[PDB]
């Protein structure tokens, strides 16, 4: 268990003993066997080669792989399925010192893989989770490793056939490049964009992980090419839907009991069409919301943190299904659900303000102040409201005649809309005035200005990063639009081209997807 | 901030005027009566009976919390940032506005420039 | 268009090749001709002298202007009208 399979070879490798590791395999020890346990704590991989690679010993890994007695298996995996390349990503921590180390080790092991086994390529393999090393880095938040992988070029002609970025030419400050995107967009198992966008938001760098070289241009290309007009068509159709729904709700029949007979006039025929369209849009939104949860199946812990704008479009349709249920049940209450679905719909146009760079932070602020600032302030305020309300209604039993009425009358004190009258006589009126004066000072002055100062901090903290927030919300929209229609992706021609630019050591010409990009830097001459 | 606030005003106003069809008797009157809630000059009365009065109170309480408390203090905190950002550079702003005035005054009258002797010599 | 008028002289100037630029005019090449195009991207001026001046080569500009075979025209401009000083 704890020491299952671990030998003096592992200790020597961890101890930086070149002689001990050499003698271990010189005697005849086999490195293929791997040690696993609960401690295996620090996860450096089970294969000894993975441990040596992760422990800053390139000489040791070279010796193990070149060992004539028993060369190490480069593509071995543990029971779970992590490979050596996966282990390298698993140990990155985004720090400047660590990034250079891990990138260097990754590059060296990759070059060794090509030199030893040109026929096989080791980067394509996937673990049990099924995500390739770049995908694993993207999902796990390792911006440094992802940046290294996405844009790396090997100038050695023999080792230049496994690079991602085939530089096309450089002409002064500008350095035209030709990236791969061979598994960034439209890769079956997973895409590097999908894992970045569909993250728990606990992943640290997702906001700043879309500034990487190919991803920025790739997303700004999909937006400019075809998505920016699909989004505006969607916004315009939602505007038409809300106008029709508002018109049909405003002009609803008022005398009678539902359902209503169809009067043979144009004014009442238009209203039935409006009702039909409003309900049909309430089924489209229902099915879209259901489909979202089936595919994503988000954790109930983080249901509102990451899918706040998908819960609201689902609720705005639940309120209308609940009204078409009560409208055919001969219940007049269908209106109490319809107008809630009406106020839901209009304020849901703040979802479409993420298609505008400057206008897209008000939606983010409203969302973040309702979940963080305003939600955990309701247990602090409610003890005050219910304590000074029970106290006030008990004192004057002998407006403040009920618990509901007293709660309402003291809530208006909190928001400065209440009147300290004291006109009506009460028994114990010197302690009633003291109670109300304490309540107003505590809630209106002291406690309501604490919320106003805590929401100000939130606004200040998420108004500096407007560029960061905007681009991720745009990437999510691009992903959703692309995935919505299959023929859209099929005819999108997302990759810049499908070109043959090099030949593998096997002697067969290789053609792959790629996308030319450009950048400008002349400071280095 | 007028596209953010107007969706709220027109959504909670159509909702409020549709609910109580059976002050809040017109779209103009409801828009006005809810605007005063945003700026803290409105009264939550509920004295006049309405059908569905437990959802009318909920609607108005949601509107006041969203607009008066949450959403109006966002504007007040965003204008504070602007004031803070352009109150540090007062020297920079002043001199350019003075240069524009000088240019306009000089160009206004030809004889003014002719007899100005602008160059030292 | 893209390569309208650009010669090995321009590439050598951009490459910091003193021998190539010297030999270009030694053979008899004329620097008065200018290369223009959509790429001309990074706008360093059309005149080769402007390019050399903008590319951190004072020796090259001095050689081009002093060149006995064909001294460069200091006050030349492109079609638009930008001069070397404007560049
Ligand atoms: C007809 C074509 C409708 C398809 C467009 C579409 O999906 O837009 C959609 C409107 O869809 C509707 O709800 C409108 C349906 C009824 C329209 C009748 C009025 C026409 C006169 C636009 O909205 P969306 O971007 O699908 O989703 C926005 C909300 N989530 C789900 C992204 C969070
Ligand atoms: C007024 C607020 C009304 C409804 C908001 C309900 C959503 C609250 C939790 C969402 C954010 C969240 O999970 O925060 C993360 C975790 O916090 C929580 O789990 C808080 C749970 C409180 C539940 C009410 C951080
Ligand atoms: C700061 C507080 C300023 C307000 C003090 C005056 C309160 C009104 C008041 O005195 O009402 C009169 C008497 O009421 C009282 O006795 C209340 C006096 C207690 C005030 C102390 C409360 C301060 C709490 C904050 C800490 C009404 O009855 P009458 O006029 O005697 O006949
Ligand atoms: C914080 C909110 C404090 C105010 C709660 C009391 C509302 C006034 C109230 O209950 O009015 C009475 C009943 O009204 C209601 O049923 C409304 C209760 C729903 C309150 C929840 C709204 C909170 C929204 C913020 C999120 C008037 O009719 P009656 O006295 O039963 O005859
Ligand atoms: C799903 C949740 C959390 C929610 C559903 C409804 C009941 C909601 O009250 C809340 C809690 C609340 C209620 C009253 C005052 C403050 C907060 O917030 C929203 C929700 C809060 C708002 C909406 O304000 C917004 O945040 C719009 C918005 C912002 C960002 C978005 O990405 C977005 O996408 C749709 C929408 C108004 C209501 O939706 C509305 O129109 C009515 C009448 C009730 C509001 O519950």
Q: What is the 3-state secondary structure (H, E, C) of A466-484?
A: HHHHHHHHHHHHHHHHHHH
A446: Cβ below 6 Å to ligand 3?
no
Chain C residues inside the 8 Å CB shell of A521: none
Query: Half-sphere exposure of residue B60, counting CA atoms within 13 Å on the CB side?
Result: 25
Task: For residue A360, count other CB atoms closer than 10 A to its CB.
Answer: 19
Binding-site residues, ligand 4, Cβ < 6 A: A 402, 404-405, 407-408, 411; B 54, 57-58, 61-62, 65
Chain A residues with CB inside 8 Å of C42's CB? Answer: 171-174, 520, 522
Inform me whether the C-beta atom of residue A170 falls under 8 Å from chain C C-beta atoms.
Answer: no
Which among A122, A29, A45 is positioned nearest to A89, based on CA atoms?
A: A45
Query: Can you give the C-alpha Rg of chain A in angstroms?
Result: 32
Set of chain B residues whose Cβ sits within 8 Å of the Cβ of A365: 74
Residue B94 burial (CB count, 10 A): 10
* Tokens describing residue B46: 């509920």
Interface test with A, best of C11, C38, C40, C42 (most A CBs within 10 A): C42
Q: Cα(A410) to centroid of ligand 5, in Å?
A: 24
Q: Which of residues 249-308 of A touch B (CB under 8 A)?
A: 249-250, 252, 254
Q: How many Cα atoms within 13 Å fall on the side-chain side of residue A7? A: 15
Beta bridge partners of A511: A500
Pocket of ligand 5 (CB under 6 A): A 308-309, 311-313, 315, 340, 343-344, 347-348, 350-351, 363, 366-367, 370; B 59, 62, 65-66
Q: Distance from the CA of B61 to the center of ligand 4, in angstroms?
A: 8
The answer to whether residues A221 and A475 touch, using CB atoms and an 8 Å cutoff, is no
User: What technique was this entry resolved by?
Assistant: cryo-EM
Backbone angles phi, psi at A510, to 5 degrees: -115, 125
State whether residue C44 sits within 8 Å of chain A by CB: yes
Chain A: closest CA distance from residue C72 (Å): 22
How far does chain B reach from its first CA to its final CA, in angstroms?
54
Contacts of C55 in chain A (CB under 8 A): 172
Report DSSP state, residue A301. Answer: G
As a whole number of angstroms, the distance between CA A479 and CA A492 comes to 13
d(CA A11, CA A13): 5
Please judge whether C14 and A520 are an interchain contact, meaning their C-beta atoms are less than 8 angstroms apart. no
Q: Count of residues for chain C?
A: 87
> d(Cα A255, Cα A248) in Å, to the nearest integer?
16
CA distance A227 to A481: 7
Residue A2, strand partner residues:
none
**DSSP SS3 for A490:** helix
- Give resolution, Å, one decimal: 3.0
Cβ–Cβ contact A369 with B under 8 A:
yes
Distance, C-alpha A284 to centroid of its chain: 24
- The residues near C11 (Cβ < 8 Å, ≥ 6 apart) are C20
Go through A263-285 and write b for each residue having 16 or more CB atoms within 10 A of its CB, e for each that does not: eeeeeeeebeebbeebbebbeeb
Do residues A299 and A280 lie in contact, with contact meaning Cβ atoms separated by under 8 Å?
no
Cα(first)–Cα(last) distance of chain A, in Å? 58
Query: How many other C-beta atoms are found inside a 10 Å radius of the C-beta of residue C47?
Result: 26
Residues belonging to the binding site of A for resiniferatoxin are 308-309, 347, 354
Residue linked to tokens 């409105």: B42
Of the residues B45, B46, B47, B54, which should be mutated to test ligand 4's pocket, given the most ligand atoms within 8 Å of the CB? B54
The answer to whether the annotation marks C62 as part of a ligand binding site is: no
Of A163, A146, A134, the C-alpha closest to A210 is: A146
Q: Does the beta-carbon distance from B64 to A415 stay under 8 Å? A: yes
Edge-first strand order for the sheet with A509-517 is A169-171, A174-179, A509-517, A497-503
């Amino acid at each position: 268990s704890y020491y299952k399979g671990q030998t003096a070879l592992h200790i020597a490798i961890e101890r930086r003993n070149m002689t001990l590791v050499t003698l271990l395999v010189e005697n005849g020890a086999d490195v293929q066997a791997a040690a696993n346990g609960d401690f295996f704590g620090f996860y450096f991989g089970e294969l000894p080669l993975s441990l040596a690679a992760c422990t800053n010993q390139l000489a040791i890994v070279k010796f193990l792989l070149q060992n004539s007695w028993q060369p190490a298996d480069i593509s071995a995996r543990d029971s779970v399925g992590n490979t050596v390349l996966h282990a390298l990503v698993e140990v990155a921590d985004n720090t400047v010192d660590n990034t250079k180390f891990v990138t260097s080790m990754y590059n060296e092991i990759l070059i060794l893989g090509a030199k030893l086994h040109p026929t096989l390529k080791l980067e394509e393999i996937t673990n049990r989770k099924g995500l390739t090393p770049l995908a694993l880095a993207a999902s796990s938040g390792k911006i440094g490793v992802l940046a290294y992988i996405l844009q790396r070029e090997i100038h050695e002609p023999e080792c230049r056939h496994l690079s991602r970025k085939f530089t096309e030419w450089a002409y002064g400050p500008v350095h035209s490049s030709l990236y791969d995107l061979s598994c960034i967009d439209t890769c079956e198992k997973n895409s590097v964009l999908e894992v970045i966008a569909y993250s728990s938001s606990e992943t640290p760098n997702r906001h700043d992980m879309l500034l990487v070289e190919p991803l920025n241009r790739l997303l700004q290309d999909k937006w400019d090419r075809f998505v920016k007009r699909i989004f505006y068509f969607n916004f315009f159709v939602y505007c038409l839907y809300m106008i029709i729904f508002t018109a049909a709700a405003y002009y609803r029949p008022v005398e009678g009991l539902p359902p209503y007979k169809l009067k043979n006039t144009v004014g009442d025929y238009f209203r039935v069409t409006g009702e039909i369209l409003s309900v049909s849009g309430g089924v489209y939104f229902f099915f879209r919301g259901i489909q979202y949860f089936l595919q994503r199946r988000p954790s109930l812990k983080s249901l509102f943190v990451d899918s706040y704008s998908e819960i609201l479009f689902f609720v705005q349709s639940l309120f209308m299904l609940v009204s078409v249920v009560l409208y055919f049940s001969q219940r007049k209450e269908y209106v109490a659900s319809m107008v809630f679905s009406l106020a839901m719909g209009w304020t849901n146009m703040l979802y479409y303000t993420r298609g505008f760079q400057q206008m897209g932070i008000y939606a983010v602020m409203i969302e973040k102040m309702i979940l963080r600032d305003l939600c955990r302030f309701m247990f602090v305020y409610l003890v005050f409201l219910f304590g000074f309300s029970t106290a006030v209604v008990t004192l004057i039993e002998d407006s403040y005649n009920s618990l509901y009425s007293t709660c309402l009358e003291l809530f208006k004190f909190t928001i400065g809309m209440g009147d300290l009258e004291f006109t009506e006589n009460y028994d114990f009126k010197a302690v009633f005035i003291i109670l109300l004066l304490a309540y107003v000072i505590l809630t209106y002055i002291l406690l309501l200005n604490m919320l106003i100062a805590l929401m100000g901090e939130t606004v200040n903290k998420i108004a500096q990063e407007s560029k960061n927030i905007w681009k991720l919300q745009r990437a999510i929209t691009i992903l959703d639009t692309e995935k919505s229609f299959l023929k859209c992706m099929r005819k999108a021609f997302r990759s810049g081209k499908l070109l043959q630019v090099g030949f593998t050591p096997d002697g067969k010409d290789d053609y792959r997807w790629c996308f030319r990009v450009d950048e400008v830097n002349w400071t280095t001459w």
